[PDB]
Amino acid sequence: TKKRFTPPIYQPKFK
Amino acid sequence: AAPKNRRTIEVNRCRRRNPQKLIKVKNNIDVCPECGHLKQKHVLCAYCYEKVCKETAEIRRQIGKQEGGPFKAPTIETVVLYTGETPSEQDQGKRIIERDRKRPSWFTQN
Amino acid sequence: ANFVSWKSRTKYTITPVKMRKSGGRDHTGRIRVHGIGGGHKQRYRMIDFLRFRPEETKSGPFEEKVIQVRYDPCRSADIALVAGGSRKRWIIATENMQAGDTILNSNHIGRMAVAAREGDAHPLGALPVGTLINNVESEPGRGAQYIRAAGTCGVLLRKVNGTAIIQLPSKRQMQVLETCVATVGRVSNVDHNKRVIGKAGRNRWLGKRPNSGRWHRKGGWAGRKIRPLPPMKSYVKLPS
RNA sequence: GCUAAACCUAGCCCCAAACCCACUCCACCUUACUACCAGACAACCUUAGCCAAACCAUUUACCCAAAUAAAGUAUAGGCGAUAGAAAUUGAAACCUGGCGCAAUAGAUAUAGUACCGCAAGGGAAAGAUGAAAAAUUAUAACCAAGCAUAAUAUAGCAAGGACUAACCCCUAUACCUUCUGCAUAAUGAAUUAACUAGAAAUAACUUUGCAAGGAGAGCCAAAGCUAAGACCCCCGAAACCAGACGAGCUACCUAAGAACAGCUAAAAGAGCACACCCGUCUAUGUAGCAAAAUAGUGGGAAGAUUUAUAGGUAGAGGCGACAAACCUACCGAGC
RNA sequence: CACACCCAAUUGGACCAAUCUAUCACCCUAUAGAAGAACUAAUGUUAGUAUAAGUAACAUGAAAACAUUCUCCUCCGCAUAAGCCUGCGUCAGAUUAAAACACUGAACUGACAAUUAACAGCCCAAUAUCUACAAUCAACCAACAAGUCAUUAUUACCCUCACUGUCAACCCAACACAGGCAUGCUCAUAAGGAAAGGUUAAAAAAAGUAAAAGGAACUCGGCAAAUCUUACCCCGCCUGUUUACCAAAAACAUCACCUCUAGCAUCACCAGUAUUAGAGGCACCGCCUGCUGGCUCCACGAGGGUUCAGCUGUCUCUUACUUUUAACCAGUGAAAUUGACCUGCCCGUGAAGAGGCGGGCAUAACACAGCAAGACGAGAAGACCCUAUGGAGCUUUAAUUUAUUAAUGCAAACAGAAACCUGCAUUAAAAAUUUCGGUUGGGGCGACCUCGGAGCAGAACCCAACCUCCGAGCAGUACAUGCUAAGACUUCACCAGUCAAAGCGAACACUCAAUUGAUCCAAUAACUUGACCAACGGAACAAGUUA
Ligand SMILES: [K+]
Ligand SMILES: [K+]
Ligand SMILES: [Mg+2]
Ligand SMILES: [Mg+2]
Ligand SMILES: [Mg+2]
Ligand SMILES: [Mg+2]
Ligand SMILES: [Mg+2]
Ligand SMILES: [Mg+2]
Ligand SMILES: [Mg+2]
Ligand SMILES: [Mg+2]
Ligand SMILES: [Mg+2]
Ligand SMILES: [Mg+2]
Ligand SMILES: [Mg+2]
Ligand SMILES: [Mg+2]
Ligand SMILES: [Mg+2]
Ligand SMILES: [Mg+2]
Ligand SMILES: [Mg+2]
Ligand SMILES: [Mg+2]
Ligand SMILES: [Mg+2]
Ligand SMILES: [Mg+2]
Ligand SMILES: [Mg+2]
Ligand SMILES: [Mg+2]
Ligand SMILES: [Mg+2]
Ligand SMILES: [Mg+2]
Ligand SMILES: [Mg+2]
Ligand SMILES: [Mg+2]
Ligand SMILES: [Mg+2]
Ligand SMILES: [Mg+2]
Ligand SMILES: [Mg+2]
Ligand SMILES: [Mg+2]
Ligand SMILES: [Mg+2]
Ligand SMILES: [Mg+2]
Ligand SMILES: [Mg+2]
Ligand SMILES: [Mg+2]
Ligand SMILES: [Mg+2]
Ligand SMILES: [Mg+2]
Ligand SMILES: [Mg+2]
Ligand SMILES: [Mg+2]
Ligand SMILES: [Mg+2]
Ligand SMILES: [Mg+2]
Ligand SMILES: [Mg+2]
Ligand SMILES: [Mg+2]
Ligand SMILES: [Mg+2]
Ligand SMILES: [Mg+2]
Ligand SMILES: [Mg+2]
Ligand SMILES: [Mg+2]
Ligand SMILES: [Mg+2]
Ligand SMILES: [Mg+2]
Ligand SMILES: [Mg+2]
Ligand SMILES: [Mg+2]
Ligand SMILES: [Mg+2]
Ligand SMILES: [Mg+2]
Ligand SMILES: [Mg+2]
Ligand SMILES: [Mg+2]
Ligand SMILES: [Mg+2]
Ligand SMILES: [Mg+2]
Ligand SMILES: [Mg+2]
Ligand SMILES: [Mg+2]
Ligand SMILES: [Mg+2]
Ligand SMILES: [Mg+2]
Ligand SMILES: [Mg+2]
Ligand SMILES: [Zn+2]
């Protein structure tokens, strides 16, 4: 039950 | 709730091109007797309404130059005068507004 | 770490010197002593623990007049400002010391003992047996290091062949030369141990931080485990 | 007919050859790129571990200066996995080449730039007319999915047999993978284009050469020997170790500062109650204003308080009023 | 009439797309050689575009001469510090997306312009020598936590105002983000602003207001709301502290008490010295007790229960109105999801819960708004065991170690003696590496793992695991229980095991159902011997626990 957090992935801005 | 399957274009055309979605043709359009521009039966002519507002703004600009500031509304009637006109018999004791322009034909002096 | 000790002054002065706290950190910057940090700022007042220090132009026994006995933040006991000749210096005050009193500092050892007065500094070879003493030194010219705390006092148990037995406040005997200079009587603030902190806030005023919250099952006897011998290993625990 | 689709260079890869670069002026180890004052600080020290032994604990290949051969031999080794010589032998050696790549390829590179991260560090995307742009009256036609042209008529894996005829009739339980057995309501796939996965030894076999001999020293041979052909994949952990980088968030500490109305009270880790700090309950919100907020209601609010600035402690650790808390939005061991 | 032309894994073939090379060929081919040599599938990579969907969501106070004025809000504003670095000044632009708009369009592009030191920053000749007495209106008084501000002597020296910061609607949060953000003033403004794009007034949802009669009958619970309200029990002395992002507590800390360790200095402890310091337990005080333990009790608590009274739409039983949302019109325009769908109902069947299969019934086609029964609806998290000769944290009388550190010993060395250092041993400390063998739904407690026999496959052989039951891990007689050697059996492989004529040599293949253990290694002159290696085809030596 350990708290698992997945940070959001920011795509490169050039797209 | 997420879609279980992708809706096909054939299904989409029946919804997008349904007669309700389509724009309804208007049958209330008629030509203005004065200028000939298009108008609706229950709506004032756009061309004829614009010419009144153009003249109204010029008249209201002349009022501002006479009052010379806010909170100076006159307690008497107002008369709009053009070039080549004189105050009338009933236009006595009123605020005459001079306009350096010929009187418009649609504007009838009263 | 770029740690420089504040103890850089090389000339003695009665002026309170500003000192910077350590927080239990050594020169490396890591904690070496726990529970130390914060508290009210203090200025260190240098204490001359060598009572018999004759002036440059003088020698032999000399006298000092007490100017003021005041509070010292650094130490438990109080301190006294004394003036001897043309100089002033801080010393550790005794239980009975007032402003105006005259203390005597000598290095003379007479054939017979002398009337010991509280606050005076005489060698251990000229003090009567049993008299309470404080601020003793291991050897001559070493300076007082023992029996400094408030109310502490030693006992001159015996004197044989130029050496004397000093009973420390921890009830331990110590043998030092009879030429060591000691102060007669107890130290000031006798009722220092009778104080009540009152609240946890006052302990943070003295620069002491709360103890760790970990439940330490380890201790003097609990943590250290006697290894059972193979014959005794069978009898260590019996089901009941 | 729109969106688009096509193109050939830029340059690169592997070799050969030959041993490479760095003072125009000014500034640059202090807070680098900062004209201009007493320093004394000084460098050197076995790698480890993953992995193999189907665990693991001894052990486990890593150019050390001549290709070949001796030879995988002598030796070494939980005498297991595996490791492994030497004496001795002894060859050629002419850069300007390609059954190398051609914009998702070839270097990451149009550039270590944009951008991301406090830092160490990570790391792109793309260009295309013609001899002439001082011809733009251009650079025809046709091609993915997606659309438009052109919404739909009972009924059903969407098809097949058909039929005069789209449908109507009859027949038919999607694909892959994993299990004894999948229409399975088990796994995977919106779709299009491009890219993306079987590398090698002994022996044997097959086809030539020569033959008690074979082979361009060494090696094998009781028909062998020499040469060729023909057999052994891809993605994915949590981890471990080494060396760096991080305390501008947070934990605690150091230095020197700042803040706390009014009222009741009293020289109070006192009460009420703003600023401020905290986050009890409820509701909203749940790709939200917000990778933790909003409204109301609450705890503290002269103290073990709150807070700005600079410094310190760094991962076999730090720090901790112990919550296995925190150490830059995944800390039972950071990146 | 034709005939190689309907199996998984695997195996044997015959052909072969495209490409490069050799040689041909010359509207795209041939024979060979070579290889980055063929994609309906890896929650594949990159890119394009669909689906959800023109949906969610987003925005501009009113009139007007666009002078101005009006309505409303202000929990804000101005400045400095820090940070940022030209980021709504002017002009022009084929301009044209800031989440709407836009001609002057402009928080876009290009050019031009700018912030001027008095404020702030950037300071100081040497050597000695000086500096006991807070602050708080500092005067009373009263303290402890003991504090935030000073020179002189001599020598040297009389040149002068440089340099840098100065803008803005601004910073940290991927954004023009309802968040974060130090200080001085204003404490309601003299400054700064706009909640409504337009319309309609459905449901559902959110916030708010009002309510007959009743007043907790609601509910796990008086949660919310209303009102401004009494009495206790449990736990914790109290203020305080903690899981930043689900736990604020009864947990931690805390005075007080108690235990343990230490007789001393030049970097922590400490510029200290047992009335001290450190490591800990417990949680004040008071009472009682042993020679350490138990109750009581003041306040206190967003702790956990209980209760009087009141209060109330919590409820009997809901209703009305307002605002946001909503729906429609205009502008802008996402995301999870998605095998293909031409996507009905009832029984039956079926990897057992059918829109798709069987049998019946129903059925023109299409939007829009609701609903949440189904599509074992979608995303992510987690539970549940199990598996891995997969990890990690922790603990220890798991195994393996002392390199390291400390204390000693002897050697070395000095030496009229002693130390330091070094080498080698011996304890201890603190650590280091590594592992948790299987079987019995799970756990506990026990049993089990090899070999022989029976129930046990009635008749060649083999074969019923689990299960039920009884055994074996010997002993005895020999001492040719010597040496050799045809042919066979074989526990379904191998290893191992079994029988054996003849012959030499002697005499005149021992009994027994099982009665057993490989290799390496060790010992030995040789012979030969060595393991409840019983987990019995055996790892040289490794436990427990994880909520
Ligand atoms: K392993
Ligand atoms: K509480
Ligand atoms: Mg304590
Ligand atoms: Mg404790
Ligand atoms: Mg292994
Ligand atoms: Mg393992
Ligand atoms: Mg490339
Ligand atoms: Mg690239
Ligand atoms: Mg097409
Ligand atoms: Mg049909
Ligand atoms: Mg289905
Ligand atoms: Mg299934
Ligand atoms: Mg899928
Ligand atoms: Mg290891
Ligand atoms: Mg491992
Ligand atoms: Mg900090
Ligand atoms: Mg208070
Ligand atoms: Mg209060
Ligand atoms: Mg804390
Ligand atoms: Mg705990
Ligand atoms: Mg725990
Ligand atoms: Mg982190
Ligand atoms: Mg046939
Ligand atoms: Mg070919
Ligand atoms: Mg390929
Ligand atoms: Mg393809
Ligand atoms: Mg694919
Ligand atoms: Mg919808
Ligand atoms: Mg909407
Ligand atoms: Mg608005
Ligand atoms: Mg100035
Ligand atoms: Mg204003
Ligand atoms: Mg409205
Ligand atoms: Mg609206
Ligand atoms: Mg009512
Ligand atoms: Mg009830
Ligand atoms: Mg309430
Ligand atoms: Mg408490
Ligand atoms: Mg109290
Ligand atoms: Mg509290
Ligand atoms: Mg929390
Ligand atoms: Mg907190
Ligand atoms: Mg909470
Ligand atoms: Mg406690
Ligand atoms: Mg009740
Ligand atoms: Mg009641
Ligand atoms: Mg009503
Ligand atoms: Mg719209
Ligand atoms: Mg999408
Ligand atoms: Mg249908
Ligand atoms: Mg059914
Ligand atoms: Mg049917
Ligand atoms: Mg539903
Ligand atoms: Mg689901
Ligand atoms: Mg296994
Ligand atoms: Mg473990
Ligand atoms: Mg056999
Ligand atoms: Mg075994
Ligand atoms: Mg076995
Ligand atoms: Mg067997
Ligand atoms: Mg627990
Ligand atoms: Zn008209």
Coordinates of C-alpha atoms (C1' of nucleotides) in Angstrom, one line a residue, chain E residues 50-286:
Chain E
rA50 C1' -9.2 10.7 -37.3
rU51 C1' -12.7 9.2 -32.9
rA52 C1' -14.7 11.2 -28.3
rA53 C1' -16.3 16.6 -30.6
rG54 C1' -17.3 21.3 -32.8
rU55 C1' -18.1 18.3 -27.0
rA56 C1' -15.7 19.8 -22.0
rA57 C1' -13.8 24.4 -21.0
rC58 C1' -12.5 29.6 -21.6
rA59 C1' -14.1 35.5 -22.1
rU60 C1' -16.0 41.8 -22.2
rG61 C1' -19.9 46.3 -15.9
rA62 C1' -23.5 50.1 -18.6
rA63 C1' -24.6 54.3 -21.8
rA64 C1' -22.2 57.7 -24.9
rA65 C1' -19.9 63.2 -28.5
rC66 C1' -16.0 57.7 -27.5
rA67 C1' -14.9 64.1 -24.5
rU68 C1' -17.1 61.7 -20.6
rU69 C1' -20.3 59.9 -17.0
rC70 C1' -22.7 56.2 -14.1
rU71 C1' -23.1 51.4 -11.2
rC72 C1' -20.3 48.3 -8.1
rC73 C1' -15.9 46.1 -5.7
rU74 C1' -11.6 47.1 -2.9
rC75 C1' -8.4 41.3 2.2
rC76 C1' -6.1 46.3 -1.4
rG77 C1' -2.6 50.0 -2.8
rC78 C1' 2.4 52.8 -3.0
rA79 C1' 7.6 52.2 -2.1
rU80 C1' 12.0 49.5 -0.8
rA81 C1' 14.6 44.6 -0.6
rA82 C1' 15.1 40.2 -3.5
rG83 C1' 14.3 38.4 -8.3
rC84 C1' 13.5 39.3 -13.4
rC85 C1' 16.3 42.0 -17.7
rU86 C1' 13.2 46.1 -21.8
rG87 C1' 8.6 42.3 -21.1
rC88 C1' 0.9 47.2 -23.2
rG89 C1' 6.6 54.2 -24.6
rU90 C1' 6.5 56.1 -30.1
rC91 C1' 6.3 54.7 -35.3
rA92 C1' 5.6 51.3 -39.1
rG93 C1' 4.2 46.4 -40.6
rA94 C1' 2.7 41.1 -46.8
rU95 C1' 1.2 42.0 -40.1
rU96 C1' -2.4 39.3 -37.5
rA97 C1' -4.4 34.3 -32.3
rA98 C1' -3.2 36.8 -26.8
rA99 C1' -6.8 30.4 -24.8
rA100 C1' -13.2 35.5 -27.4
rC101 C1' -12.3 40.1 -30.1
rA102 C1' -9.7 43.7 -32.8
rC103 C1' -9.4 48.5 -38.2
rU104 C1' -6.3 52.9 -34.1
rG105 C1' -5.3 46.6 -35.2
rA106 C1' -1.9 44.9 -30.1
rA107 C1' 0.6 41.9 -24.0
rC108 C1' 2.9 39.9 -32.3
rU109 C1' 7.2 41.5 -35.7
rG110 C1' 10.9 45.4 -37.1
rA111 C1' 12.9 50.2 -36.1
rC112 C1' 13.5 54.2 -32.8
rA113 C1' 13.5 56.1 -28.0
rA114 C1' 14.9 55.5 -22.7
rU115 C1' 16.3 54.8 -16.3
rU116 C1' 21.0 61.4 -15.7
rA117 C1' 22.8 61.3 -8.0
rA118 C1' 22.0 64.1 -3.6
rC119 C1' 19.4 58.0 -2.5
rA120 C1' 22.0 53.1 -2.5
rG121 C1' 26.5 50.4 -3.3
rC122 C1' 31.8 50.6 -3.8
rC123 C1' 35.1 52.4 2.5
rC124 C1' 39.6 53.1 6.3
rA125 C1' 47.9 53.9 7.2
rA126 C1' 50.9 51.1 10.9
rU127 C1' 52.1 49.4 15.7
rA128 C1' 50.9 48.9 20.4
rU129 C1' 47.2 50.1 24.1
rC130 C1' 42.1 50.5 25.8
rU131 C1' 36.5 48.7 26.2
rA132 C1' 33.1 45.4 34.8
rC133 C1' 28.0 48.5 35.2
rA134 C1' 21.9 45.8 29.4
rA135 C1' 17.4 46.8 26.9
rU136 C1' 12.5 48.1 27.8
rC137 C1' 10.0 56.6 27.1
rA138 C1' 15.1 54.5 31.5
rA139 C1' 13.3 57.8 35.6
rC140 C1' 10.5 54.7 39.4
rC141 C1' 10.4 49.5 40.7
rA142 C1' 11.3 44.3 39.3
rA143 C1' 14.2 40.8 37.1
rC144 C1' 17.0 36.7 34.2
rA145 C1' 17.4 34.1 29.8
rA146 C1' 22.7 38.4 31.4
rG147 C1' 22.3 41.1 26.6
rU148 C1' 22.1 45.1 19.9
rC149 C1' 26.2 49.7 19.5
rA150 C1' 33.2 53.5 23.3
rU151 C1' 39.4 54.3 22.7
rU152 C1' 44.2 56.4 23.7
rA153 C1' 49.7 57.0 22.7
rU154 C1' 53.3 57.8 18.8
rU155 C1' 54.4 57.7 13.6
rA156 C1' 52.5 58.6 8.6
rC157 C1' 49.2 61.9 5.9
rC158 C1' 46.4 68.0 3.9
rC159 C1' 45.3 65.0 -3.2
rU160 C1' 39.6 65.7 -3.8
rC161 C1' 33.2 64.0 -5.7
rA162 C1' 35.2 58.9 -9.9
rC163 C1' 32.7 54.2 -10.7
rU164 C1' 28.1 51.1 -10.7
rG165 C1' 22.5 50.4 -9.6
rU166 C1' 17.9 53.7 -11.3
rC167 C1' 12.5 51.2 -17.0
rA168 C1' 7.9 48.1 -17.0
rA169 C1' 1.6 45.9 -16.3
rC170 C1' 7.8 42.5 -13.5
rC171 C1' 9.4 37.4 -9.3
rC172 C1' 8.9 31.5 -7.9
rA173 C1' 4.9 27.9 -9.7
rA174 C1' 5.6 24.2 -17.7
rC175 C1' 0.7 29.5 -18.7
rA176 C1' -1.5 36.7 -18.6
rC177 C1' -2.1 30.1 -12.9
rA178 C1' -8.1 31.7 -7.3
rG179 C1' -1.1 29.5 -5.2
rG180 C1' 3.9 31.2 -3.0
rC181 C1' 6.2 36.3 -1.8
rA182 C1' 10.5 40.2 3.2
rU183 C1' 9.9 45.2 5.1
rG184 C1' 8.0 50.6 5.5
rC185 C1' 3.5 53.5 5.2
rU186 C1' -2.2 53.9 4.0
rC187 C1' -6.2 50.7 7.9
rA188 C1' -10.2 52.6 4.1
rU189 C1' -8.5 55.0 0.6
rA190 C1' -6.3 60.7 -2.0
rA191 C1' -4.5 54.6 -4.5
rG192 C1' -6.0 50.3 -7.3
rG193 C1' -10.0 47.7 -9.8
rA194 C1' -14.8 44.9 -12.8
rA195 C1' -18.2 39.3 -10.6
rA196 C1' -22.6 39.5 -16.0
rG197 C1' -20.3 37.7 -24.4
rG198 C1' -26.0 37.7 -25.6
rU199 C1' -30.5 35.1 -24.5
rU200 C1' -33.8 31.7 -22.1
rA201 C1' -35.2 31.0 -16.7
rA202 C1' -36.0 22.7 -18.0
rA203 C1' -34.0 18.7 -15.2
rA204 C1' -29.6 17.3 -12.5
rA205 C1' -25.5 19.7 -9.7
rA206 C1' -23.1 23.9 -6.4
rA207 C1' -23.7 28.1 -3.2
rG208 C1' -27.2 31.2 -0.5
rU209 C1' -32.0 32.9 1.6
rA210 C1' -36.9 32.0 3.6
rA211 C1' -40.7 28.3 5.8
rA212 C1' -46.6 26.2 8.5
rA213 C1' -47.0 22.4 12.8
rG214 C1' -43.3 19.3 15.1
rG215 C1' -37.9 20.0 17.1
rA216 C1' -32.8 15.1 16.3
rA217 C1' -38.2 11.3 15.3
rC218 C1' -32.4 12.1 10.5
rU219 C1' -27.8 9.6 11.1
rC220 C1' -22.2 4.9 12.2
rG221 C1' -22.2 9.8 15.0
rG222 C1' -26.4 16.7 16.5
rC223 C1' -22.0 15.6 10.3
rA224 C1' -23.6 20.1 8.2
rA225 C1' -26.8 24.3 9.6
rA226 C1' -29.0 27.0 13.5
rU227 C1' -28.3 28.6 18.5
rC228 C1' -24.6 31.0 21.7
rU229 C1' -25.4 26.2 25.6
rU230 C1' -25.1 22.2 31.1
rA231 C1' -23.0 17.9 33.4
rC232 C1' -19.4 13.8 33.1
rC233 C1' -16.3 9.3 31.8
rC234 C1' -11.7 7.4 29.0
rC235 C1' -6.7 8.9 27.5
rG236 C1' -2.7 12.3 27.7
rC237 C1' -0.1 16.6 33.3
rC238 C1' 0.1 21.3 30.8
rU239 C1' 2.3 25.3 26.1
rG240 C1' 4.7 22.8 22.3
rU241 C1' 6.1 18.7 18.2
rU242 C1' 5.1 14.8 13.8
rU243 C1' 3.7 11.3 8.8
rA244 C1' 5.0 18.6 3.0
rC245 C1' 0.5 15.3 -0.8
rC246 C1' -5.3 10.4 2.9
rA247 C1' -3.3 9.3 10.0
rA248 C1' -2.4 16.2 14.6
rA249 C1' -3.4 11.4 18.0
rA250 C1' -3.8 8.1 23.3
rA251 C1' 2.1 9.0 19.6
rC252 C1' 6.9 12.2 20.4
rA253 C1' 8.9 16.1 23.3
rU254 C1' 8.2 18.4 28.3
rC255 C1' 9.7 20.6 33.4
rA256 C1' 10.2 16.9 37.8
rC257 C1' 12.4 12.3 39.0
rC258 C1' 15.8 8.3 37.9
rU259 C1' 19.9 5.3 35.8
rC260 C1' 24.6 5.0 33.5
rU261 C1' 29.6 7.0 32.0
rA262 C1' 33.7 10.6 32.8
rG263 C1' 39.0 13.6 37.6
rC264 C1' 40.1 16.6 32.5
rA265 C1' 42.1 21.8 28.6
rU266 C1' 44.2 25.0 23.3
rC267 C1' 39.0 23.5 16.8
rA268 C1' 33.0 19.8 19.1
rC269 C1' 32.0 18.8 24.5
rC270 C1' 34.7 23.9 26.3
rA271 C1' 37.7 28.7 26.1
rG272 C1' 33.8 24.2 30.5
rU273 C1' 35.5 20.9 35.5
rA274 C1' 31.0 16.1 39.2
rU275 C1' 25.8 21.8 42.2
rU276 C1' 29.7 19.8 35.6
rA277 C1' 29.3 17.1 30.9
rG278 C1' 27.4 13.0 28.1
rA279 C1' 24.4 8.6 27.1
rG280 C1' 19.4 7.0 28.4
rG281 C1' 14.4 5.8 31.1
rC282 C1' 10.1 7.9 32.7
rA283 C1' 6.7 12.1 32.1
rC284 C1' 5.1 17.5 36.6
rC285 C1' 3.5 18.0 41.4
rG286 C1' 1.2 15.2 45.9

